[PDB]
Amino acid sequence: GGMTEEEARRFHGYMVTGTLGYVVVASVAHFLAWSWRPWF
Amino acid sequence: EYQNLFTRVQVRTVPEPGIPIDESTGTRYGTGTFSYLAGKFGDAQIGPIYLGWAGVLSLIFGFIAIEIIGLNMWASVGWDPVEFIRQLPWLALEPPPPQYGLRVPPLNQGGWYLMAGFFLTVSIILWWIRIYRRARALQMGSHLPWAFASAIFLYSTFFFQPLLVGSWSEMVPFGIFPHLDWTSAFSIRYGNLYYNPFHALSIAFLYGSAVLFAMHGATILAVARMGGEREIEQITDRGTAAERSMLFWRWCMGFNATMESIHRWAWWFAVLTTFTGGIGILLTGTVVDNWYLWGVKHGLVAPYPAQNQLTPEQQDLLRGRYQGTAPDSFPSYVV
Amino acid sequence: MMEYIDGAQIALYAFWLFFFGLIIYLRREDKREGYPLESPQGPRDGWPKGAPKKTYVHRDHG
Amino acid sequence: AMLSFEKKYRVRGGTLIGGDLFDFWFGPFYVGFFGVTTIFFVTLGTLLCVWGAAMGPTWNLWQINIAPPDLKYGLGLAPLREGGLWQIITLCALGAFGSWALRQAEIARKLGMGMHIPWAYGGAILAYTTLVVIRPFLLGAWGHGFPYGIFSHLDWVSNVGYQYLHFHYNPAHMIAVTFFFTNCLALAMHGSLILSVTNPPKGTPTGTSEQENVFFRDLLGYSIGAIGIHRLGLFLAVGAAVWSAICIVISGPFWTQGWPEWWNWWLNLPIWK
Amino acid sequence: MHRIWLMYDPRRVMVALVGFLAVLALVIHFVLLSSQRYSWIENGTLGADQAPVGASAPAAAAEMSPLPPGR
Amino acid sequence: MHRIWLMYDPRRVMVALVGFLAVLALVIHFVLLSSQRYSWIENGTLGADQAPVGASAPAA
Amino acid sequence: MHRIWLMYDPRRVMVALVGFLAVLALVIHFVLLSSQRYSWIENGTLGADQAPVGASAPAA
């Protein structure tokens, strides 16, 4: 199957942005968990 | 030297068998497919199944039996799904209390057990009928359903022996380690099952079944390069693979089967495992209550030097009681 | 009443009679191929005498 | 005597040791060098078993009991009355079982067969060698072997089992039992299928590989094929003996508590500790 | 860095990634749920100063010579 | 980003999703039912102040 | 040194490396979590002076 470098560059734009957005959500979840009950 | 233990070159066919031989009533369920992993060890086709009326009902009755067991197990850990997986092999659905005998017990104290046992038994009988009908529809002999009837016979003795001694409490609990606890305690209650001669015979055929399948499996693989695995053609049109198989065992141990008759030795060894087993269970607690003492009477038991000697006052002191009911109170001892 | 004879002993001898009968049957089946034996003294059957060699009918196809 | 097709096959060749010297038959039996050694060890081992019976309390077949030595003798040969006779018989039995396997290889070679049968029998020899050599040696005394006696060895099996309180909880034993039970099921299915196509109801043509594959397919949901069922039967039967040898060698040398408390690791997985 | 997707089928990548994150998330929740400090379904309403803490190293003498609980 | 459905066959995704959501929903409900605090079948009619709370630290 | 990527397929070494790191990381975390000293989920808020220590020699 094909996969051109413009398709790869378009996919990378979504894959990075989705990854970072998920890490941002997770960062808020840890901010909430820590303010509720710190683990250190 | 090629060992013929796995297949380095499989071949696919685009149309397929799995569309059955001409079969009449019922329906072929699903479309045939190939597994490459199945094709490594055996034939690659994973494919269509037949049920008919007896197969459908067997699955319905059997599913209910499985649900009742699992739901009771899950209830027994207070519906905790973590403890359900963590403790799964220790969980059971447990038979009724002994004091009921054969009477119907309370729902949470064996009533669910007898229900699951009933639907499982009906499901097993309907599966036997399903196999019997399928063997005849494919225009085959009835060897397989009668072999399966031998397994069902042993299974039924886990109902009939409790019936004969007069209590559903004696039945086998549904559960992985709990049914092994029962298996040990059965031998304890009846004074060591090693001295039951039908148990000894059942082991002789269980071991013999491994001996025969090891010998026969190896023999056919050893002649498979000469077409020896085409066993039906070696039976109808004897080739050198059959002749060499006969001569190997003849030259080894002085006698041999044929390519057909080795499958009769195979069939009877497997069938006699569970048939002699069932007889031994039915005799236990009904004819013999202590198999070791039956062994002493009939001369089975090898003598050992005494490890202790009791005085006559110890003989009275060291008798116990038979086990009774549990204390149904929490005593205060204060005065 | 019979002290020594009991139902487990009776059942065991019933099995032995059946089992030896079965071994005889299986040994007759084992002798449908390769028998009677060739020997310098002429043909030999052993014991029990083998069942006859069996003919198989193939199908007429469809 | 000979099977009607046999004479053609009785060539010289395929021996491992003796060459032509022992390359002959006695009635149906092939001899060879390992046939000679087999009969030596069989006769010596049997006559010593009969001597053990003679000096024991009874001739009753079920009650004869030739016991290993006390544990205090360690890895030495005990006095013959005291277990040394068991130790000699054990050497004869090893010599016989080994000779039998190597004789089977000479027979397979003479027939141009694969070596499957000698090796499949090696699984049983392994299990015996584990019970009387490897496990006793790891425990440090020959007295850990089982006694030679039709029921007295069952007393040994019983007591070894309860040395671990509840031997059913041995995890390798569960696997070994599963193989033995699966093997007996598979043997009944394979035996039934072949007989059902070769002995169909009267007035029915002889069946075919297609019919047995179709029947087998709707029994298990997949078709195993002719080579596959023989590979499986060999795998299950020999695998049972190998897992049996594992289950007994771990009991004592490697694990000493009750077997039920081995399962404590499963309760303590950190997802649910 | 985008050329990593020339090297791997993105349909295989995303499925493996989502399966990895699902299993990791499940494992961390169930590890916490079995602890005492983070048994949040039973004890989540406790304040942080009231939540359980795994016990310290002993009192430095690490030794016994007690006095009874009061009757 | 509807073109996600071009690289993934939605026929496969919707079955995978519904299977996941079904199992996860049941696991959560049974975890709660198994707990003291949320054993709602036996104790659902208790008020929030009456509902059980797991044990604190010992000095608390 | 970049010439090793002609000797070995980068596509396959990367998968093997990611797998190796994941296994090693999970092993070390669970080894620590099972210890007394580093049972950080229960005792992570203890100060370093308060955390458990494995028993010393009696020095006698």
Add this chain to the structure above:
Amino acid sequence: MHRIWLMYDPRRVMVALVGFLAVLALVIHFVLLSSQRYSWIENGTLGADQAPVGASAPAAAAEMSPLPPGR
């Protein structure tokens, strides 16, 4: 001495070598971690004089036995 390598594929040599070192390293670590003296995750903060040392002798009272009596 380099002629030793003419017999071998160098890629396979390296894969063989790395596998040997990985196994050996893990064996030595798990042996030490299972010891008393080098159980460093629990006791790594002990000073060298404070760390465990194997007994130069055992001892007993004369009537005590670790093993039960028996032939």
Add this chain to the structure above:
Amino acid sequence: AATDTVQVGYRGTAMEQNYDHGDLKTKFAQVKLPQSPPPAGESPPGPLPWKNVQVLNDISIAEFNRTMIAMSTWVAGTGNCAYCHNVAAFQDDTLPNGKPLYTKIVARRMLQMTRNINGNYSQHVKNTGVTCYTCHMGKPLPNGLWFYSSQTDYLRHYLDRDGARVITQGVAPSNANRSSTKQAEWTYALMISQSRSLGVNCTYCHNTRQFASWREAPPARVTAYHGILMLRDVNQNYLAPLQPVYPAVRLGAMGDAPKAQCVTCHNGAYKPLYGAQMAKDFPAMWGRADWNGVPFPGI
């Protein structure tokens, strides 16, 4: 990784005990190193001054003080007389607050219990005997304390139950024995507990080809039976009636007193303290007119 074995039955019967050699050495050294040493003892004349002594009437004043030092180190740590006493007034059974010294009134009962064990149950404890150290081992709480929980709890074999037999002593079934397979499971559970309590396996007390056989069993089975009868007396007459004496922190959820079991003395060893003989050194606790021929030094 070496395994020690002890043969306890005939050749070839596999009646053997197995021990992991490393595990056993650490357990054994863990007993040796803490094992509390005894004071030397001495022989004065003169009449007893005591104001409120009710059990130890029969020993000299020096032997009495020697016994109190032992009791302190065995239950409370050495010299900890404040654990039991209002140390200003040893004769008191109450604090200055008037609230009772519950430990002292328990300890008086534990003296009577120990004398009763060493005296009436010599078929079990023989000349090893027990001291406070056997259970307490230097701490206020022994191991293996148990409370009421469920009716079918097998530890009630050590209190208010009696029968455990399930095997028929004849070939044929009879009305004499109607035991359930469930009852054999219950005895099996009980017997695993006894095996673990001593760190032994079933072959220590049985030839498992016939569990009911006494002739084929090692003699330890007879000692074990006397241990059951001893625990029933200990629990029913001494430990369980202390319910109104303890603070409610000691009581079970049913409000019952803590009870003992085999593991309380044995602590996973075939004899308590691997057979350390201490009762001989403390005549205050013999309950017996002579210990292995050494006569009781009564007044």
Add this chain to the structure above:
Amino acid sequence: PVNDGIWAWYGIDDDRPMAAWSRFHATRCVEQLAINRARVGAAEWALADVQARGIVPCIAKAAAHLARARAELADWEAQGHRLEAARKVTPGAWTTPVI
């Protein structure tokens, strides 16, 4: 992967398209060229046989198989040309040509 098999788990893969010089890929290429030319020869012999006996649905598949054998050969010829170009520009490469 049929050629490297288990060693593909460790990232040895000498089939992959290669444009720098590599003695391992050149070795694989020389082996596979010979095998695929023999395989093309057998495929067109089989077509000639089945054309001669005239069975229409078999002639169709024999031609389809031959086309696939030619295509699989052409890939190895392309690999051979890449490596042979790289051989000429790279010191210490083979003296015997690829393809």
